[PDB]
Amino acid sequence: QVMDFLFEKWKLYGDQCHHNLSLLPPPTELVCNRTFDKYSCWPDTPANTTANISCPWYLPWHHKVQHRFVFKRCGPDGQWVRGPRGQPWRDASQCQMDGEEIEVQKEVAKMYSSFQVMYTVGYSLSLGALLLALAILGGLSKLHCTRNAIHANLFASFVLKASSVLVIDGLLRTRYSQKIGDDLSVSTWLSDGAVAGCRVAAVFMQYGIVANYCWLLVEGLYLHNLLGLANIFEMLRIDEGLRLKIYKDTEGYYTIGIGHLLTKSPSLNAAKSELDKAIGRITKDEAEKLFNQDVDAAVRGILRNAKLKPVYDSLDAVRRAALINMVFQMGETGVAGFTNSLRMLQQKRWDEAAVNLAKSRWYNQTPNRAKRVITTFRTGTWDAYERSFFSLYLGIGWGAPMLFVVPWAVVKCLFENVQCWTSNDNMGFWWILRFPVFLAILINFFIFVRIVQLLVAKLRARQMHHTDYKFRLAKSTLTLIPLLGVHEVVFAFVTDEHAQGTLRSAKLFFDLFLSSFQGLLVAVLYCFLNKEVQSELRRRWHRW
Amino acid sequence: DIQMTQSPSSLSASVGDRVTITCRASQGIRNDLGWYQQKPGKAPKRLIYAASSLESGVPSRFSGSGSGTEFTLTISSVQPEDFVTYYCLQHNSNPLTFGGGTKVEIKRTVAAPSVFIFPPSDEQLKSGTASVVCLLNNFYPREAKVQWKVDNALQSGNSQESVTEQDSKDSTYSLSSTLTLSKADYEKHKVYACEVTHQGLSSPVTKSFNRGEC
Amino acid sequence: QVQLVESGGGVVQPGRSLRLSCAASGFTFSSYGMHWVRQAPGKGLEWVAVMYYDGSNKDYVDSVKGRFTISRDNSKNTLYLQMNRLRAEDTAVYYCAREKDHYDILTGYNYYYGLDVWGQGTTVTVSSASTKGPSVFPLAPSSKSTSGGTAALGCLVKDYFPEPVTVSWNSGALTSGVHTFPAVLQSSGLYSLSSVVTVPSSSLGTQTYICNVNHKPSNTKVDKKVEPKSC
Ligand SMILES: CS(=O)(=O)c1cccc(NC(=O)N(Cc2ccc(C(=O)Nc3nnn[nH]3)cc2)c2ccc(C3CCCCC3)cc2)c1
Ligand SMILES: *[C@@H]1O[C@H](CO)[C@@H](O[C@@H]2O[C@H](CO)[C@@H](O)[C@H](O)[C@H]2NC(C)=O)[C@H](O)[C@H]1NC(C)=O
Ligand SMILES: *[C@@H]1O[C@H](CO)[C@@H](O[C@@H]2O[C@H](CO)[C@@H](O)[C@H](O)[C@H]2NC(C)=O)[C@H](O)[C@H]1NC(C)=O
Ligand SMILES: *[C@@H]1O[C@H](CO)[C@@H](O[C@@H]2O[C@H](CO)[C@@H](O)[C@H](O)[C@H]2NC(C)=O)[C@H](O)[C@H]1NC(C)=O
């Protein structure tokens, strides 16, 4: 294929040479007859003298050795100096390639090519499934979804991984291969557009490989942060935050923990009055004692306010936590000013209340906090608070690999510059490439143990049902963490032990065949096996 | 020019034995060597190429090895058909050079020749010449010496020997020596002897006649 | 179907010339380099010429240089060997053979893979002698041509040219214990061989023993009856 074009260029050079030697005049001395020695165009040369001509233009690496010259020695006989079998003999050391034609035996080359189609079709089938699932989520009824957003970004890293391998294999088939007797000799040389092209693809591959396990950590962290209770302590811990040191505020007081005022006059030493009473002697069990008492005092206040009591009674436990959130920030008299908004919540008119709450001056001051509280009244669940971590989840999936891969690209460019990076030095790929992946798996197993202990507590409580969406999503995430968390660790532990070779080529195609269908497995169990998407598929299809 | 020293020139082996033929190249010729088989009357057929690689459709017993200067052909278990001539061939440098040619012969017990002397026929003497032939029959090994002695004095440069190939049934050889001399020379002498010397003889066999025989 | 069939070789006179021909079938003749190899009647195999498609690359053995000239016609799929100024040393069986070669366009080096497919061989006999028939003389079994119970008797196929002759005994009936020696070029230039048989001492006088020499080139059939010498 690639050699067919070269053979056409060579035939063109041969035709072009035979015409250039035709027009020259016949020799009047006994000189080395002008000839095309299957490599270059040589004019008549006198005996006992070495000739030279510029490296032929048909070669792929023309511009790299165009300044260089090939040589051919003329002998005393009047005949050119020949090789061992009488073939033409020329010194083409200068015009030679920047690489080596690596031979591979008849059956061994047929084995590598046979296993090559298995991983080309494997990644193509996965890419086809990945892009099918991405089209279903990203252009249908789950458009502005919080759960499907994490899946789409997880598939996106696999699409790049599947894309990079298909490009690299497509650029590795641009090498020149020819059969030398039994062996198939493949040249290590690549074109200037292919050397740079596969180098970029190698960066995009390594960026994808790290991102896959980073977004696998996000999938694990999603269940851990979603499924944990969810309590008012986590709700206000996102809105205000935990703190051990006392800091000033808009009224001029000593604010500590999650929204607590210690002393009524501006002072530092007198703030230990109410702190020692709660402690009885600041940590996470000590500081939460101040927080728990605050929430109880907020509920006390809501029930002692005539305007706030009936609204608080009518609303459910999750919606109550949204009102306590407001009273925490504003106060009893401040939240009681929402006479029109509160009325709409007592009537159970959520979307009508969502418009009137945003129109008030509370949303004007702090829009980020109020938007999450308004959503809690709207849907009646903690949907807004699981999305607060999404910005941080985005920085851990795309930002975290760039902390390791972008500095590695610059290291491999100047230190060990190779054609298509897949070296076995164990210096750059272990600390720069494997470390961010091995640390993700380390944190994933620490999450996995926390997921099971959170599952057993929930499976015996009031939210114990098996047909729940949180139970369904766990069946996928608890499978992809141990399957991927073992596949890449078992491969890296035993890969420097074998030479090339006999047991290595069988071991490589064992793991690479699973790695090719890795993207298909992720797509199937998260999108295609998903019941919620299957219901909307039947809804969208049965309409016609 | 590369001298292909092939050893041995003729090895004696019996069916089942591992035969080892070796060809030694005068210069470094890389793996560029080919081992050939010639059957009686047939063209030479390559069994091994590239020094070690076996040609497509050649019995697995045949195997090549070596590189550069020492090269080896090995037949793990000779079969009846393998008892023929073999040659090495260098294709590294012109001029191409073959080996001398090892002849794999079928081994057997040492048997002495039965000797038979035949005087020249009466019809031959009428024409002009007189050929006295002597016959060394069914013997092993191949190596044998035939001495012509006319009037008890030794004769040189007047005979031509001929040896047959190994026999198909009893694996022996047979040889005939034709002593040519003119009718004039033949009538000068009386006693014509044929002394035979061979590995299975303790004493040389000498079959003679006296011209006339009556 | 991949084969090579030689032709042209026969009986020539020293000094005169002869053009051997080798006709390829079953393969792309233009791809493969071709060789000529000879073998003497009593000696081993000897290489003699080579050529490639160019055909600026030709080579010969020092002994045949200038004398012999190799050529090819890729359209007719034929190799040739014009053999001028022929000498007695050229008497041989001439085989032709193909060699696959590969040129690496990237490095500019040639890789050779030996003489794979061979012909069958066309005999060339270079001598002055005329196509003379044999004179067959008997080899009589007396009392000194009998080593106990086993007695030997034979024929002498003398002064014939060219080779070969096909001796058979008692009209092809007798085969057991017959030996037909290979021919020997005598000092005259003609060939001479002997065929000899071993038969029981008693069976003389009861059985008659007749050798059948058939010299096809000169068109001769001689049947000689071998009678024991009893005066
Ligand atoms: C004891 S338990 O019953 O509580 C339980 C615990 C852990 C895992 C599983 N199950 C499982 O391991 N499976 C089947 C399966 C189930 C649900 C989905 C799915 O739709 N999940 C989803 N919904 N929404 N988003 N994601 C998908 C799959 C499973 C079985 C085999 C495989 C592959 C293993 C590798 C070879 C190919 C099959 C993957 C998942 C149940
Ligand atoms: C090799 O060189 C000669 C020129 O020296 C080419 O032409 C031959 O020149 C001689 C001059 O003495 C003539 O007698 C011949 O008739 C010319 N032609 C041939 C075919 O012999 C010759 O063509 C050159 N070889 C090639 C292959 O081009
Ligand atoms: C060989 O190549 C060189 C250019 O690379 C040509 O120029 C000659 O260079 C050599 C030293 O390499 C000098 O000795 C000569 O004086 C240079 N020649 C001229 C004309 O200036 C050269 O012409 C090429 N060809 C040959 C046949 O030598
Ligand atoms: C190339 O140089 C060599 C060495 O001086 C020349 O070879 C000699 O050629 C002459 C005839 O011109 C012979 O008599 C000598 O015997 C040769 N020398 C040797 C050592 O054998 C040769 O002539 C030169 N080339 C040309 C075209 O003249």
mmCIF file of C-alpha atoms in Angstrom, chain C:
data_model
loop_
_atom_site.group_PDB
_atom_site.id
_atom_site.type_symbol
_atom_site.label_atom_id
_atom_site.label_comp_id
_atom_site.label_asym_id
_atom_site.label_seq_id
_atom_site.Cartn_x
_atom_site.Cartn_y
_atom_site.Cartn_z
ATOM 1 C CA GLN C 1 3.296 -26.680 -12.939
ATOM 2 C CA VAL C 2 6.572 -24.799 -12.056
ATOM 3 C CA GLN C 3 9.255 -26.493 -14.216
ATOM 4 C CA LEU C 4 12.321 -26.091 -16.456
ATOM 5 C CA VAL C 5 13.001 -28.307 -19.510
ATOM 6 C CA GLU C 6 16.492 -28.275 -21.082
ATOM 7 C CA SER C 7 17.240 -29.075 -24.714
ATOM 8 C CA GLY C 8 19.782 -28.833 -27.518
ATOM 9 C CA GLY C 9 22.679 -30.805 -26.081
ATOM 10 C CA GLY C 10 24.029 -33.675 -28.114
ATOM 11 C CA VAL C 11 27.238 -34.897 -29.791
ATOM 12 C CA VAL C 12 29.580 -32.099 -30.907
ATOM 13 C CA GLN C 13 33.155 -31.908 -32.236
ATOM 14 C CA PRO C 14 35.969 -30.164 -30.324
ATOM 15 C CA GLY C 15 36.402 -26.593 -31.590
ATOM 16 C CA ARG C 16 32.832 -26.285 -32.912
ATOM 17 C CA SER C 17 30.025 -24.650 -30.944
ATOM 18 C CA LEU C 18 26.630 -25.635 -29.463
ATOM 19 C CA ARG C 19 23.671 -23.622 -28.152
ATOM 20 C CA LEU C 20 21.898 -25.149 -25.165
ATOM 21 C CA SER C 21 18.334 -24.085 -24.474
ATOM 22 C CA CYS C 22 16.301 -24.140 -21.216
ATOM 23 C CA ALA C 23 12.549 -23.464 -21.404
ATOM 24 C CA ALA C 24 10.740 -22.157 -18.337
ATOM 25 C CA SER C 25 7.067 -22.680 -17.562
ATOM 26 C CA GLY C 26 4.870 -22.257 -14.498
ATOM 27 C CA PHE C 27 6.397 -18.973 -13.219
ATOM 28 C CA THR C 28 7.166 -15.320 -13.969
ATOM 29 C CA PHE C 29 10.522 -15.780 -15.833
ATOM 30 C CA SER C 30 11.197 -12.009 -15.802
ATOM 31 C CA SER C 31 11.375 -11.911 -11.952
ATOM 32 C CA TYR C 32 13.900 -14.739 -11.408
ATOM 33 C CA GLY C 33 17.644 -14.792 -11.998
ATOM 34 C CA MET C 34 18.831 -17.899 -13.808
ATOM 35 C CA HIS C 35 21.861 -20.162 -13.649
ATOM 36 C CA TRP C 36 23.629 -22.891 -15.584
ATOM 37 C CA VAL C 37 25.273 -25.884 -13.859
ATOM 38 C CA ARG C 38 27.188 -28.789 -15.421
ATOM 39 C CA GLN C 39 28.211 -32.235 -14.134
ATOM 40 C CA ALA C 40 30.972 -34.426 -15.586
ATOM 41 C CA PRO C 41 30.309 -38.169 -16.212
ATOM 42 C CA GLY C 42 32.425 -39.387 -13.224
ATOM 43 C CA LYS C 43 32.686 -36.153 -11.174
ATOM 44 C CA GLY C 44 30.481 -33.886 -9.009
ATOM 45 C CA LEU C 45 28.471 -30.766 -9.740
ATOM 46 C CA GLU C 46 30.133 -27.595 -11.075
ATOM 47 C CA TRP C 47 28.575 -24.113 -11.470
ATOM 48 C CA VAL C 48 29.236 -22.364 -14.838
ATOM 49 C CA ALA C 49 27.107 -19.294 -15.532
ATOM 50 C CA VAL C 50 24.562 -16.858 -14.164
ATOM 51 C CA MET C 51 22.399 -14.026 -15.473
ATOM 52 C CA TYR C 52 19.732 -11.551 -14.329
ATOM 53 C CA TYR C 53 16.914 -9.602 -16.055
ATOM 54 C CA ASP C 54 19.075 -6.465 -16.709
ATOM 55 C CA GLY C 55 21.069 -8.287 -18.220
ATOM 56 C CA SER C 56 24.248 -6.254 -17.596
ATOM 57 C CA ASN C 57 25.067 -8.643 -14.683
ATOM 58 C CA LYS C 58 26.464 -11.888 -16.120
ATOM 59 C CA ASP C 59 29.190 -14.112 -14.734
ATOM 60 C CA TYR C 60 31.062 -17.284 -15.701
ATOM 61 C CA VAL C 61 33.642 -19.692 -14.281
ATOM 62 C CA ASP C 62 37.317 -18.885 -15.180
ATOM 63 C CA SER C 63 37.559 -22.084 -17.307
ATOM 64 C CA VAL C 64 34.655 -21.126 -19.652
ATOM 65 C CA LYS C 65 35.256 -17.298 -19.786
ATOM 66 C CA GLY C 66 34.869 -15.859 -23.315
ATOM 67 C CA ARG C 67 34.210 -19.399 -24.639
ATOM 68 C CA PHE C 68 30.638 -19.675 -23.235
ATOM 69 C CA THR C 69 27.905 -17.003 -23.461
ATOM 70 C CA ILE C 70 24.629 -17.004 -21.515
ATOM 71 C CA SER C 71 21.467 -15.237 -22.781
ATOM 72 C CA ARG C 72 17.699 -14.971 -22.212
ATOM 73 C CA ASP C 73 14.387 -14.197 -23.950
ATOM 74 C CA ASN C 74 11.809 -13.289 -21.277
ATOM 75 C CA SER C 75 9.034 -13.156 -23.916
ATOM 76 C CA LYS C 76 9.723 -16.794 -24.965
ATOM 77 C CA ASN C 77 10.539 -17.730 -21.323
ATOM 78 C CA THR C 78 13.832 -19.295 -22.414
ATOM 79 C CA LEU C 79 17.406 -19.268 -21.084
ATOM 80 C CA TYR C 80 20.303 -19.995 -23.451
ATOM 81 C CA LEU C 81 24.002 -20.913 -23.362
ATOM 82 C CA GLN C 82 26.076 -20.465 -26.524
ATOM 83 C CA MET C 83 29.144 -22.690 -26.032
ATOM 84 C CA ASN C 84 31.970 -21.745 -28.466
ATOM 85 C CA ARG C 85 35.505 -23.240 -28.817
ATOM 86 C CA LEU C 86 34.373 -26.513 -27.134
ATOM 87 C CA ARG C 87 36.974 -28.803 -25.496
ATOM 88 C CA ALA C 88 36.972 -32.401 -24.128
ATOM 89 C CA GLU C 89 36.691 -31.063 -20.535
ATOM 90 C CA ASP C 90 33.182 -29.682 -21.412
ATOM 91 C CA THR C 91 31.677 -33.186 -21.791
ATOM 92 C CA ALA C 92 28.891 -32.938 -19.194
ATOM 93 C CA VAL C 93 25.223 -33.032 -18.289
ATOM 94 C CA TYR C 94 23.927 -29.431 -18.285
ATOM 95 C CA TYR C 95 21.230 -28.349 -15.767
ATOM 96 C CA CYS C 96 19.573 -24.901 -15.592
ATOM 97 C CA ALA C 97 18.163 -23.381 -12.360
ATOM 98 C CA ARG C 98 16.315 -20.310 -11.069
ATOM 99 C CA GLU C 99 17.382 -17.995 -8.210
ATOM 100 C CA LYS C 100 14.899 -15.633 -6.509
ATOM 101 C CA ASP C 101 16.495 -12.257 -5.662
ATOM 102 C CA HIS C 102 15.033 -9.308 -3.739
ATOM 103 C CA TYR C 103 16.070 -5.638 -4.002
ATOM 104 C CA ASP C 104 15.380 -3.391 -0.983
ATOM 105 C CA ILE C 105 14.425 -0.062 -2.598
ATOM 106 C CA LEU C 106 14.954 1.832 0.721
ATOM 107 C CA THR C 107 18.554 0.642 1.400
ATOM 108 C CA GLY C 108 19.725 -0.319 -2.101
ATOM 109 C CA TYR C 109 20.911 -3.837 -1.255
ATOM 110 C CA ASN C 110 20.201 -7.159 -2.944
ATOM 111 C CA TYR C 111 19.250 -10.366 -1.074
ATOM 112 C CA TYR C 112 19.768 -13.761 -2.784
ATOM 113 C CA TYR C 113 18.014 -17.070 -2.030
ATOM 114 C CA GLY C 114 19.999 -19.826 -3.858
ATOM 115 C CA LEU C 115 19.115 -22.220 -6.711
ATOM 116 C CA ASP C 116 15.537 -23.382 -5.816
ATOM 117 C CA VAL C 117 14.004 -24.922 -9.015
ATOM 118 C CA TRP C 118 16.251 -27.014 -11.310
ATOM 119 C CA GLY C 119 15.837 -28.648 -14.716
ATOM 120 C CA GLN C 120 16.520 -32.292 -15.606
ATOM 121 C CA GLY C 121 19.816 -32.098 -17.554
ATOM 122 C CA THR C 122 20.823 -32.240 -21.225
ATOM 123 C CA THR C 123 23.929 -34.322 -22.037
ATOM 124 C CA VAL C 124 26.694 -32.740 -24.129
ATOM 125 C CA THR C 125 29.332 -35.116 -25.542
ATOM 126 C CA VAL C 126 32.303 -33.352 -27.174
ATOM 127 C CA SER C 127 34.447 -35.776 -29.210
ATOM 128 C CA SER C 128 35.890 -36.295 -32.708
ATOM 129 C CA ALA C 129 34.732 -39.934 -33.144
ATOM 130 C CA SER C 130 32.022 -41.058 -35.641
ATOM 131 C CA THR C 131 28.796 -42.776 -34.524
ATOM 132 C CA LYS C 132 30.315 -46.270 -34.511
ATOM 133 C CA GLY C 133 28.458 -49.481 -33.540
ATOM 134 C CA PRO C 134 29.817 -51.946 -30.937
ATOM 135 C CA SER C 135 31.737 -55.147 -31.533
ATOM 136 C CA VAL C 136 30.437 -57.598 -28.910
ATOM 137 C CA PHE C 137 32.929 -60.354 -27.843
ATOM 138 C CA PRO C 138 32.144 -63.223 -25.409
ATOM 139 C CA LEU C 139 33.755 -63.912 -22.038
ATOM 140 C CA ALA C 140 33.881 -67.717 -21.798
ATOM 141 C CA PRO C 141 33.532 -69.621 -18.453
ATOM 142 C CA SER C 142 36.330 -72.326 -18.361
ATOM 143 C CA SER C 143 37.664 -74.351 -15.309
ATOM 144 C CA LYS C 144 39.589 -71.221 -13.992
ATOM 145 C CA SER C 145 36.361 -69.115 -14.329
ATOM 146 C CA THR C 146 34.617 -71.169 -11.606
ATOM 147 C CA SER C 147 35.085 -70.410 -7.870
ATOM 148 C CA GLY C 148 33.437 -73.587 -6.555
ATOM 149 C CA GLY C 149 29.723 -74.003 -7.318
ATOM 150 C CA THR C 150 29.434 -70.431 -8.677
ATOM 151 C CA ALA C 151 30.699 -69.713 -12.215
ATOM 152 C CA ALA C 152 30.774 -66.323 -13.948
ATOM 153 C CA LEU C 153 30.415 -65.486 -17.652
ATOM 154 C CA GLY C 154 29.960 -62.237 -19.598
ATOM 155 C CA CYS C 155 30.064 -60.055 -22.711
ATOM 156 C CA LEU C 156 32.493 -57.411 -23.830
ATOM 157 C CA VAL C 157 30.771 -54.499 -25.594
ATOM 158 C CA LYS C 158 33.903 -52.951 -27.221
ATOM 159 C CA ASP C 159 34.620 -49.870 -29.419
ATOM 160 C CA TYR C 160 31.270 -48.087 -29.691
ATOM 161 C CA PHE C 161 30.404 -44.345 -29.864
ATOM 162 C CA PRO C 162 28.453 -42.554 -28.471
ATOM 163 C CA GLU C 163 27.159 -43.787 -25.088
ATOM 164 C CA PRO C 164 24.911 -45.656 -24.073
ATOM 165 C CA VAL C 165 24.171 -49.401 -24.629
ATOM 166 C CA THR C 166 21.502 -51.461 -22.826
ATOM 167 C CA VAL C 167 22.680 -55.016 -22.198
ATOM 168 C CA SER C 168 20.181 -57.710 -21.131
ATOM 169 C CA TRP C 169 20.703 -61.441 -20.699
ATOM 170 C CA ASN C 170 18.737 -64.448 -22.108
ATOM 171 C CA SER C 171 16.252 -62.015 -23.845
ATOM 172 C CA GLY C 172 15.516 -60.177 -20.528
ATOM 173 C CA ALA C 173 14.561 -63.459 -18.745
ATOM 174 C CA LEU C 174 17.854 -63.692 -16.834
ATOM 175 C CA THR C 175 18.244 -60.875 -14.279
ATOM 176 C CA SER C 176 19.455 -62.523 -11.063
ATOM 177 C CA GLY C 177 23.180 -62.011 -10.428
ATOM 178 C CA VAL C 178 23.891 -59.874 -13.493
ATOM 179 C CA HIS C 179 26.232 -56.864 -13.251
ATOM 180 C CA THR C 180 26.497 -54.269 -16.026
ATOM 181 C CA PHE C 181 29.586 -52.139 -15.471
ATOM 182 C CA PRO C 182 29.581 -48.424 -16.394
ATOM 183 C CA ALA C 183 31.345 -47.537 -19.647
ATOM 184 C CA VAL C 184 34.995 -46.415 -19.950
ATOM 185 C CA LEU C 185 36.284 -44.009 -22.599
ATOM 186 C CA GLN C 186 39.273 -45.874 -24.096
ATOM 187 C CA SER C 187 42.488 -44.207 -25.365
ATOM 188 C CA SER C 188 41.021 -44.478 -28.884
ATOM 189 C CA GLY C 189 38.055 -42.175 -28.010
ATOM 190 C CA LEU C 190 35.421 -44.947 -28.161
ATOM 191 C CA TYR C 191 33.586 -46.511 -25.197
ATOM 192 C CA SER C 192 33.915 -50.017 -23.778
ATOM 193 C CA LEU C 193 31.842 -51.811 -21.141
ATOM 194 C CA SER C 194 31.293 -55.369 -19.976
ATOM 195 C CA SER C 195 28.118 -57.064 -18.700
ATOM 196 C CA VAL C 196 28.711 -60.190 -16.591
ATOM 197 C CA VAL C 197 26.484 -62.753 -14.827
ATOM 198 C CA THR C 198 26.942 -65.371 -12.070
ATOM 199 C CA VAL C 199 25.280 -68.769 -12.609
ATOM 200 C CA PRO C 200 25.659 -72.296 -11.205
ATOM 201 C CA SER C 201 28.648 -74.351 -12.457
ATOM 202 C CA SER C 202 26.384 -77.364 -13.211
ATOM 203 C CA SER C 203 23.954 -75.377 -15.446
ATOM 204 C CA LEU C 204 26.577 -75.039 -18.229
ATOM 205 C CA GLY C 205 25.799 -77.618 -20.945
ATOM 206 C CA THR C 206 22.116 -77.602 -19.879
ATOM 207 C CA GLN C 207 21.289 -73.850 -20.281
ATOM 208 C CA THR C 208 22.521 -71.530 -23.105
ATOM 209 C CA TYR C 209 23.528 -67.965 -22.156
ATOM 210 C CA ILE C 210 23.049 -65.148 -24.668
ATOM 211 C CA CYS C 211 23.661 -61.405 -24.026
ATOM 212 C CA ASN C 212 21.546 -58.786 -25.917
ATOM 213 C CA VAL C 213 23.363 -55.500 -26.665
ATOM 214 C CA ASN C 214 21.139 -52.715 -28.067
ATOM 215 C CA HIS C 215 23.107 -49.609 -29.235
ATOM 216 C CA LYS C 216 20.292 -47.184 -30.097
ATOM 217 C CA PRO C 217 22.285 -44.184 -31.466
ATOM 218 C CA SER C 218 24.026 -46.262 -34.190
ATOM 219 C CA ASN C 219 20.886 -48.480 -34.513
ATOM 220 C CA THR C 220 22.421 -51.809 -33.522
ATOM 221 C CA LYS C 221 21.150 -54.993 -31.924
ATOM 222 C CA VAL C 222 23.727 -57.747 -31.377
ATOM 223 C CA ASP C 223 22.850 -60.992 -29.600
ATOM 224 C CA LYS C 224 26.020 -62.920 -28.647
ATOM 225 C CA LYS C 225 25.891 -66.510 -27.415
ATOM 226 C CA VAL C 226 28.578 -67.380 -24.798
ATOM 227 C CA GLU C 227 30.053 -70.891 -25.158
ATOM 228 C CA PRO C 228 32.444 -72.407 -22.606
ATOM 229 C CA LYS C 229 35.963 -73.185 -23.892
ATOM 230 C CA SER C 230 36.303 -76.996 -24.213
ATOM 231 C CA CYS C 231 38.728 -77.343 -27.230
#
